[PDB]
């Protein structure tokens, strides 16, 4: 969705406290280090600073709640679009092998009641088929769905 709901905003306000270890209202590079290590990763100082910098809109060196929230709104929007595309991929890719075949795409159409020639279904495959293997993999599918 484009915008967060009131409830999501309140929930993300709770989430902020998971990163703001000292409760001072800001997330610092040191706090991200603590969080990452608690999750089993060990980023370098420069990586932690990059993660702060990409969110720190006002450049004062720490992340406040509105900055965190704005970033989370953008992430939720992206995740929703990417999740819909995955959902579509899984349906076209009937056998779950990672490749949409011409046969599988036919079945989708035919089940919708559409009237495409087997040649036409073949042409659609070849148009999305970047690596020339005759099938549509996930990355090729994503390019097609977002073009």
């Amino acid at each position: 969705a484009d915008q967060l709901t009131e409830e999501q905003i309140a929930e993300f306000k709770e989430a902020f406290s998971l990163f703001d270890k000292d409760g001072d209202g800001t997330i610092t590079t040191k706090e991200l280090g603590t969080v990452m290590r608690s999750l089993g990763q060990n980023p370098t100082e420069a990586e932690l600073q990059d993660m702060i910098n990409e969110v720190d809109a006002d450049g004062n060196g720490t992340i406040d709640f509105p900055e965190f929230l704005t970033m989370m709104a953008r992430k939720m929007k992206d995740t929703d679009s990417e999740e819909e595309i995955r959902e579509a991929f899984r349906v076209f890719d009937k056998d779950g092998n990672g490749y949409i075949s011409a046969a599988e795409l036919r079945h989708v159409m035919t089940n919708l009641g559409e009237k495409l020639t087997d040649e036409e279904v073949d042409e659609m495959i070849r148009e999305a088929d970047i690596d020339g293997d005759g099938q549509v993999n996930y990355e090729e599918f994503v390019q097609m769905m977002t073009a």
Binding site: M109, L112, E114, M144
Partner: protein, 78 residues
Amino acid sequence: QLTKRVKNAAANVLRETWLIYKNTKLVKKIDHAKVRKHQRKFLQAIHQARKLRSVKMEQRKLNDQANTLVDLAKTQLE
């Protein structure tokens, strides 16, 4: 560009296919007006894909034909 238009048309075919599917198979109550809308869009895209592919195919023929003429002219270069 012509290639772009072709892939773009086929992409709309695919997007509308999904939207029809979702609105037909993955909802409790089917919104028939929404389904009709995407179906119209599906048909428009398929007509476009068909049209653009046909032009692309005629274009490949013309290119070889024109190059035949170009090569004829080039027979005069020393």
